[PDB]
């Protein structure tokens, strides 16, 4: 590789729902006007990457999954204004643009032009940029960063520093700034409150380290893996609760702690049952429960409209409700400026091709955010 | 009146779920250690007064219903200097205390010294204050305004304009406040927006007013009573709609109209399926649905956590987010300035006794607000 024409690199194609990844030879076509193929350096193993091997998150397979990654640019397209090559850029699973009333609303985020609410499984014109044996393989959302190269459009490529830790700063293309932005944007943790965070994972530590900046005098953590409680207390997690150690329902306990309920509560697992237990555990009259997580598809939660009627605002968010192409660059100069710490999350840093133990740590248990290097 | 100890009067009791109100003579005792006794001037028939009757709003029985009323004091108890005898007052159904959380909280409206979350038959003391026969009759909210005289609790009551129409302002006890309180305080309707309004009657008419004052351009109101479609323009609306004129779900009709979806979708019906159809009806990524309406008993509803994940916020509220003892005073006071209208809401002033007719005027469609003079 490198070029103007077809690069013949390596990738990790899913060919089938519930099987490991086949590291392979695929051939990434040179970009198409307003696209920007990017030479991948580092990637992150999110869950929403694993929801795809189970099929809890449904996208057209066969596909080069991956979406939370950093890398450097080589080739750009026609009329491309935003990033020039040799550029460190970080790919955007939720794009930005300019027109669609959501891109033009003070409080939007979720660009009409996504591929998350009902997936085509391709580029922005309907075609691939990934051909394996002879069969084009599907891109995911609009990043596919488990290749050695990828070709993203222009509206979903953010351009950061140039002295930036991409073995670090790749947790901003998702991981951190969705759990961060939830707590400080979407929920808006009031200075001095009681926060309960269900799920103490990658995204759920950033949400507790968003509350802790928001002021938050208290912050509890609920995980059924007491093993997670440390990286947690260590992040600014005051009281950790394991629902398994308890006889009575957990909303109660959670609600007997802060009795009345916690000002704010966040669900970062994505279970229809916890997605409600988190709503029940806050305050009738002014309890703001937000859901970050991603449930098993077309699945319905059985809730009581009365839960909401006393005065609880229920929200949701993809990303941190962070306007993608002017919030990801801005959010790096900060890390670089010791605004936060990306290190306490990261538990491993594996070579790409072992990307199958990578998933198997995450899911096969405790060991929170690995970073496969390319 | 000769006020010092017990009285007898006419009350509209509801001995049984499903049967009309019997205007029995009822003997109402003196205000105790803190309360105030009131003789009623007027009352409106709010649907919630109808719910107790169906079996969908379960407070204990037998009970004097009613909660939307203005009157003047008679008696007044001990440890008091809030409202003195011969002083207009509006009974309140969601009290205050200034004691509790929600009350001390700048944004809490659900006091937590109330009887709608866990109806009791009341009286903070835990007691009687009504006996129709030799049988004690129950209180509806800290109120029961369907009797000639009732004796509330000083925590749930309020002194007002002195030179104030208790025949125009008994509607500031619910109907109008909640309608308008839910659009201007709990939705924080915006200017330029398009709010859709489900249910074009009592309260849903006041919501079509904040929506007009909050300062917006399109207020689309949806009812199954084409007949209800003009007050709705008089008082605000532009477009009016009927789900029965349609081969397509009303969700959609309404989602192209604002195509992209509405901005601020309200529901003031009490329909568990209308609660969702409106969830869905606002912008996937920045729409706010305020559940106004009071649902069936402990009947739950279904939806998938992705209507919320995309960005819509789903709040709810009682009264209209309006604290209790600080508003009805200043609200009424706004009326006097002819700062808002209270008549396009009122269609029938019927004398009490003639109550089992105003109810019979609801259930039909001939009535919006049938005020019950005394
Ligand atoms: N809204 C968005 O844009 C967005 C962004 C990123 C991730 N997500 C989703 O949020 C979730 C969190 O992502 P992640 O990478 O940190 O996942 P993860 O698997 O590493 O985290 C899941 C965590 O929840 C815990 N957990 C499991 N069952 C639990 C239960 N019953 N009660 C409490 N805790 C329980 C696990 O022990 C673990 O700590 C995923 O489902 C992901 O898909 C959404
Ligand atoms: N949250 C609170 O504190 C509060 C305060 C007051 C009233 N409420 C509740 O709000 C609701 C509205 O009360 P109201 O006094 O205005 O009642 P109302 O009878 O005057 O209003 C109901 C209206 O909605 C219309 N409607 C019903 N089903 C419909 C459907 N499927 N599709 C379209 N339109 C439909 C009906 O024709 C009727 O005109 C009730 O359930 C009441 O109990 C709640
Ligand atoms: Zn856009
Ligand atoms: Zn992710
Ligand atoms: Zn209170
Ligand atoms: Zn009412």
Curated annotation (Swiss-Prot), chains A, B:
Keyword Ribosomal protein part of the UniProt annotation: no
Major localisation: cytoplasm
Gene Ontology biological process: retinoic acid metabolic process; retinol metabolic process
E.C. numbers: 1.1.1.1
Chain positions recorded as NAD(+) binding sites: 48, 199-204, 223, 228, 292-294, 319, 369
Cofactor, how bound (note): Binds 2 Zn(2+) ions per subunit.
Binding, an alcohol: 48, 67
Top-level EC class: oxidoreductase
Binding site for Zn(2+) 1: 46, 48, 67, 174
PROSITE patterns: ADH_ZINC (PS00059)
Positions of modified residues (N-acetylserine): 1
Lineage: superkingdom: Eukaryota
GO CC terms in record: cytosol
NAD is among the record's keywords: yes
Family of the protein in this entry: Belongs to the zinc-containing alcohol dehydrogenase family. Class-I subfamily.
Protein name: Alcohol dehydrogenase E chain
Lineage: Eukaryota, Metazoa, Chordata, Craniata, Vertebrata
């Amino acid at each position: 590789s490198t070029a103007g024409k077809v690069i013949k690199c390596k990738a990790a194609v899913l060919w089938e729902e519930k099987k490991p990844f086949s590291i392979e030879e695929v051939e990434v076509a040179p970009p198409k006007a307003h696209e920007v193929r990017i030479k991948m350096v580092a990637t992150g193993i999110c869950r929403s990457d694993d929801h795809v091997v189970s099929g809890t998150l449904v996208t057209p397979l066969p596909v080069i999954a991956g979406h939370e990654a950093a890398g450097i640019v080589e080739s750009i397209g026609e009329g491309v204004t935003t990033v020039r090559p040799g550029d460190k850029v970080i790919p955007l699973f939720t794009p930005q643009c300019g027109k669609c009333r959501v891109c033009k609303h003070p409080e939007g985020n979720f660009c009409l032009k996504n591929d998350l609410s009902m997936p085509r499984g391709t580029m922005q014109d309907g075609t691939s940029r990934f051909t394996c044996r002879g069969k084009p393989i599907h891109h995911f959302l609009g990043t596919s960063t488990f290749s050695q190269y990828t070709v993203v459009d222009e509206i979903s490529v953010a351009k950061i520093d140039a002295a930036s830790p991409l073995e670090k700063v790749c947790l901003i293309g998702c991981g951190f700034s969705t759990g961060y932005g939830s707590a400080v944007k979407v929920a808006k943790v009031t200075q001095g409150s009681t926060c309960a965070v269900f799920g103490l994972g990658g995204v759920g530590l950033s949400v507790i380290m968003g509350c802790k900046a928001a002021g938050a005098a208290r912050i509890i953590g609920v995980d059924i893996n007491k093993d997670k409680f440390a990286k947690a207390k260590e992040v600014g997690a005051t009281e950790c609760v394991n629902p398994q150690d308890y006889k009575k329902p957990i909303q109660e306990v959670l609600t007997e702690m802060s009795n009345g309920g916690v000002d704010f509560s966040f669900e970062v697992i994505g279970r229809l049952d916890t997605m409600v237990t988190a709503l029940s555990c806050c305050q009738e009259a002014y309890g703001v429960s937000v859901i970050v997580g991603v449930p098993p598809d077309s699945q319905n939660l059985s809730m009581n409209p009365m839960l909401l009627l006393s005065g609880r605002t229920w929200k949701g968010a993809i990303f941190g409700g962070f306007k993608s192409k002017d919030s990801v660059p801005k959010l790096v100069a900060d890390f670089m400026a010791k605004k936060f710490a990306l290190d306490p999350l990261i538990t491993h840093v594996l070579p790409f091709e072992k990307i199958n133990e990578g998933f198997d740590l995450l899911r096969s248990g405790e060991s929170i955010r690995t970073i496969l290097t390319f």
